Amino acid sequence: DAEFRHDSGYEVHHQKLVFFAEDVGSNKGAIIGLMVGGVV
Ligand SMILES: OC[C@H]1O[C@@H](Oc2cc(/C=C/c3ccc(O)cc3)c3c(c2)O[C@H](c2ccc(O)cc2)[C@H]3c2cc(O)cc(O)c2)[C@H](O)[C@@H](O)[C@@H]1O
Numbered sequence: 001d002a003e004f005r006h007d008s009g010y011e012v013h014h015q016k017l018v019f020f021a022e023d024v025g026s027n028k029g030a031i032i033g034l035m036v037g038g039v040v
Pocket residue numbers: 008009010011012013014015019
């Protein structure tokens with residue numbers, strides 16, 4: 001069982017923007033979408 005202790009480390013203090021944290025990794029590769037109409 002993992003338990004994370006939080007003591008010092010603020011990600012937002014005085015800045016008007018929704019801050020992006022250091023974990024950004026989504027699965028992307030194939031995106032299917034064939035148009036059947038003009039050029040087949
Ligand atoms: O000398 C401190 C100067 O601070 C500035 O404001 C600030 C004071 C403090 C934070 C104050 C803090 C205080 C007590 C405490 O226990 C913990 C944190 C921090 C500021 C600004 O921006 C940092 C910030 C904000 C958003 C982020 O996404 C990332 C960083 C923040 C920051 C956070 C942090 O984890 C570590 C830092 O060294 C700084 C003021 O504008 C100045 O006037 C002042 O002189």
